[PDB]
Amino acid sequence: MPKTLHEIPRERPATPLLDRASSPAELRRLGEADLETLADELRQYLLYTVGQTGGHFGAGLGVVELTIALHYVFDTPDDRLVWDVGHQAYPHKILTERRELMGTLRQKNGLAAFPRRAESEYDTFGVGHSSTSISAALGMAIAARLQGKERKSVAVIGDGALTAGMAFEALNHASEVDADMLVILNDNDGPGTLFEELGWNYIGPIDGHDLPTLVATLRNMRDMKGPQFLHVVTKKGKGFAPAELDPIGYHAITKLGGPKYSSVFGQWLCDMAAQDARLLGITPAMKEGSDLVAFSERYPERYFDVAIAEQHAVTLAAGMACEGMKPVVAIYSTFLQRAYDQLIHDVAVQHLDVLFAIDRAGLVGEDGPTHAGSFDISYLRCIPGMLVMTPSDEDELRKLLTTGYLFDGPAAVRYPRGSGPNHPIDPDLQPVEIGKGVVRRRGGRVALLVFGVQLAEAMKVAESLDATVVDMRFVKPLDEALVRELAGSHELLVTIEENAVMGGAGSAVGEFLASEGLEVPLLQLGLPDYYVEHAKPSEMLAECGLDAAGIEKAVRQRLD
Amino acid sequence: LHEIPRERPATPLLDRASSPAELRRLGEADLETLADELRQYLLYTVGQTGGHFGAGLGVVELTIALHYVFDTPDDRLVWDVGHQAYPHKILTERRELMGTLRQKNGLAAFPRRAESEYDTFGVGHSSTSISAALGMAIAARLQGKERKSVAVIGDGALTAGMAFEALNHASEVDADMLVILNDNDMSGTLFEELGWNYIGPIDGHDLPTLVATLRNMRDMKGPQFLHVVTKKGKGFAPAELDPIGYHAITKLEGGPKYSSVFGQWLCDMAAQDARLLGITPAMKEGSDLVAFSERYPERYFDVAIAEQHAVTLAAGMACEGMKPVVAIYSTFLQRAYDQLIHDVAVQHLDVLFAIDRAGLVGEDGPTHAGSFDISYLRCIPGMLVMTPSDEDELRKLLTTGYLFDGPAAVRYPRGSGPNHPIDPDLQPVEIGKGVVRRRGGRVALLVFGVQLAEAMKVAESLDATVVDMRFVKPLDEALVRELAGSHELLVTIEENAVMGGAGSAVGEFLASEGLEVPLLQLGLPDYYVEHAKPSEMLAECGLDAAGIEKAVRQRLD
C-alpha cells in the first residue's frame, strides 16, 4: 500500500539509491525491484529541493514513476525524449546529472525552469510553451530514419497540451509519414478510438504509478514500428496529500505590496460585466494566471476557457463581436504570438471590437526567455486598426482597459506580471482620451517619453536632471502633437519601454520625427536584441538598463 | 458543359432568385433548373473577369439548398476560405455586380462583412469558419435570439489545428450549430468521438437529398456535423479533369516567377546537400516545390494546412543535423509566429524560411497581403532577415541564408522580376553588406527589395545614390553611417509596412549614433489596401517610380 505525505522535508533526505542513479546509464545498472524504492526516494528528494528553491511542484510528482521507467527502458540520450512544456521535468533533470545542481534551480546562472538544449545533452528540445513535443519528436524521427541512426523518438504530452491545434497537426502528419515514434499521453484529469482513427496504435490506459506495468509496456512498445500511442493515467501531486487535494494551488510553490496587475484586471472584468451584459471573458486555459477567477464564479454563462487553444480564442472573439457582444481575450504576451494570424486576419482586417488584455508583458523572471513578453508592442503596432496601450500603474491599467473596451475596434492593453507602485485606483469606469499622453513632470532639456511601468524609475531620474516626463499611454495612435511640442522645446528625447527596442514604441516616435523632419536627438531604451537569461525580475531589468540607475547612466552617457 | 459561354446565358429562374428571400419563393421542383442556370451564369461571369472557378462549381447545389432552407441573412452562414462563395454572392444581391469581381472598386475575392449583410465573416485564410460560427452561436444564445449558425468547411481546411480547437470547444459548450464538411476528395467515427452528431456522407449535388437533410438537421439541437461529398469543377469537364489547373482561371480572349527561381534553387541545393529537407503547409504549386517533390520525395514534406506544425517539425529536424527549408507565404507565416520564435529563434536552430508573396499580392486583397513579415521578424533576436531585389539576388540570398548556421528568412513577391541574368553558381554573399548600384550627389535611396528597379529609374532624374541593401538584420551599419555623412536626405524603400519596417531599422541605427540626417521612409501605409491589380496597389502606395520621385522631390522642398 502506497503512503501519502502531508509535509515537505526541510532537510536533505537520505536517498542512497537515488545517488547511485545520477545518470540514465547508472540507473540502467540497477535492478527492476529497486525501482519503486528509487521512486520513493526521488519523490522525497523532489519535495525537499523544490521546498528549498520553489518552482513547479505537482506535475513533476505525477511523473516520478513514468520518468524512471522511460530512462530505464530507453537508451537515453541516444534515444530521444521530448518533454511537453517541461514544468514536469524536474525528475528528468534529477536523473540526468543535475541532482546536486537542483539547489541552483531557477536562480541566476542556475538550472533553468524547463529542459533546455544548451543546458544538457539529455534535453532534446527547449520547451516552455506547450504542445510542441509531438512535432519536435516527429522531426527528430524523420531525420534519424533518413540518417539510418536507429534511434527511438518519444514525446510525453499532458492531456491539456493535447487540446492545442498544433498537437493535432503533428498526430495527423506522423500518421502520414508512418513515423516510428511513441507518444505517451500523460493524462491526469472511451479514450482509444480517436487516436486509432487518426492512424495511431493505441495502448491503454495503464496506471502511470505502477512501475512494473510501466516498464513492461514500454519494453514492448520500444521496438514496435509505426506511430504508437500509450495512454498513461497519473495523479497530479501524487504522494503529497495537499497537492493531491488542491492541484491548482500546488501547480507551483514558493520556497519555504499593491495588488497584482492581473488582480486589477480581474476586478475590472467583474466591475464592467456588472455594468454591461455584453462583456464576455475568454482565456486559453489561464484562468488563475490572468485571474478571471471571481469573474468565472460570478458570470459563469459569460466565461469561456477554450483550453490551450489561443488561435480559437481569438477567432471565437471575432465571431462574438460580429453579433454585438464585447469579448475580452485574456492572454499573455508570449502566448499571443501563437494567435497572431487570428488577431490580424479575423480581428484587425475586419476592425472588430475585441479587447486584448495582454498580461506578462516584459521580462517575466524565473520562467526565462521562453515566456518573455518582449515583442507585443513591435508585432502589434505594425498592424492597421490596432489601438495599442501601455499603462504605467494600477489606476492607468483600469482606465486603459475601459478605454480599449469601449473603443469601437480592436485594442491591446499590455501589463507585466507582479504588482505595481501601489498608487490609488479610481473605482469608476470611465475611459480617457485616445491618443493623448499625460505630462507627469514639467522640466527642461531632456524629455523622458515613457510607455509603461518604468515611469516611476524615470521620475527618480528626472529629479536629478530636472527632466520632463510624459506618461505616453498610447503607442498607437501616438500623441503626435505632444511629441512635436517636446521635440522643439527639448534637446533630447528619451523613449522607455519594456519591449524590444527593435520595432518598439520608441521607433514609433522615431518614425514620427522622421516623417516631419524633426531633427531632435533620440535615445531609445528598452529590451536588447538577445534572449535575457532567467533571473529575478529586478536582476533582469538591471541587466537591460531599465532601473533608475541604468536609465540615468544611459541618459548621462548620451549627454556627455 | 465543354465551353465557357462567351455571351450571357438565359436564366429566367435565376433572375427571379436575386436574393435568398426570392429564392425561397420558388418551388423545390424549380431548384434543379436553377442550379443548371446558376452554373452556366457562374461559368459565364468568371470567364469575363477571372477568378476562382472549380470550388464554386462544386457548391452550386449546396449553396442553393442552404439559402433555400435557412432563413438567411438572419440565420448565419459562414464560408470557410471563401473562394467557393461565388454562387453565394450570385444569390445575395450581387449577381449583376459579378462583372466587377476582383477589379478595383468591385466585388472582393472573398465574402466580406463590409460588402454585404449576407457575409457574416470576412475570410481568405482557411479554417476560421467553425470558430466564427461558434462565437455567433454563443452570442445568439446569450442574447436569446433563435438564429441558426452554419459553417461550410472543406476537407483540406479540417487539417488545420484551429479547426480542431473549435470542434472540441463547440462540443464543450454544447453549441447549437451545424458544420457542413464539403468533402471533394470523396468519402464519421472521429467527429462522433469529438462530441458531434454525424450525418452522411451524402451526395452534395443531389438537391432533393440536400434540401431534405438540411431541413431535418436545421432544427436539431447541439453540435451537428453534415458530411457532403462534392466534385471539384462539377459540371465543367476541363475543370473536373484538371482541378489544380481550374482552381483559378484568367479571363478569356517575361522572366521566371520568383517562386520558380526558389524552386530551381531548392532542387540545385538538394542535389549538392543530402541533408536539405523541403517543407510546405499545403502550397506545393504556389511556392513551387513541384519538381522538388518529384526528384526528392523522401526529403519533401507537405504537412497539410498546418503552418504551426511545419515550423516546429523543421526545428526537430534541425536538432538531428538535417537542413530544413520552410516554404511559406508571408501572410500564412503569421499563423506560425510562435513556433518560429519559441521553437526556432530562441533555440537558434538552423532553419531557412523562404517567404513568398511578400508585399502586396493584388486581387486576393488584404487578407493575403505579405505586409508585415519584416516588422514581425526583425524584432526577434537571432534572425537573419534578407530582401532580394531580383532573380539573381534571390538565388544568392537563399544560399546565404542556407549556409548560415541559424534562423534565416528571405522574402520575395508573387509574380516575376526585371529578368536579369542569373548566376548558375550556388555561392553566398557577405552577410550584412549592401551593394551600391549607383553613385549620386544629394539623395541616397536605401532599397530593401524589388523596388530597386523603380528606384533606379528615379535615381537618374535626381542624380541620386542607390543602395541594394540586401539585409534588414544585420543592417550594413557602416554603409549607412557613410551615406548619412555624404547626403542631405536618406530614403528607405521596402514593400512592407513602414511601421516597424526596414526603414525603421535604419532610423533606429541613426538615432542610436546621433546621426541627424533627414530620413524619408517609403513603404506600405497603415491601412489595408483594397484589392486591385498589383500595379494599381503599388501606385496607390507610392512604390512605383513616379510615386517614389514625387515623394523625394516633395521632401527636398
Ligand SMILES: [Ca+2]
Ligand atoms: Ca476554466
Ligand SMILES: [Ca+2]
Ligand atoms: Ca492615473
Ligand SMILES: [Ca+2]
Ligand atoms: Ca453578421
Ligand SMILES: [Ca+2]
Ligand atoms: Ca534542372
Ligand SMILES: [Cl-]
Ligand atoms: Cl536596430
Ligand SMILES: [Mg+2]
Ligand atoms: Mg494535464
Ligand SMILES: [Mg+2]
Ligand atoms: Mg508610476
Ligand SMILES: [Mg+2]
Ligand atoms: Mg477540398
Ligand SMILES: [Mg+2]
Ligand atoms: Mg543553414
Ligand code: NA
Ligand atoms: Na472618478
Ligand code: NA
Ligand atoms: Na489556373
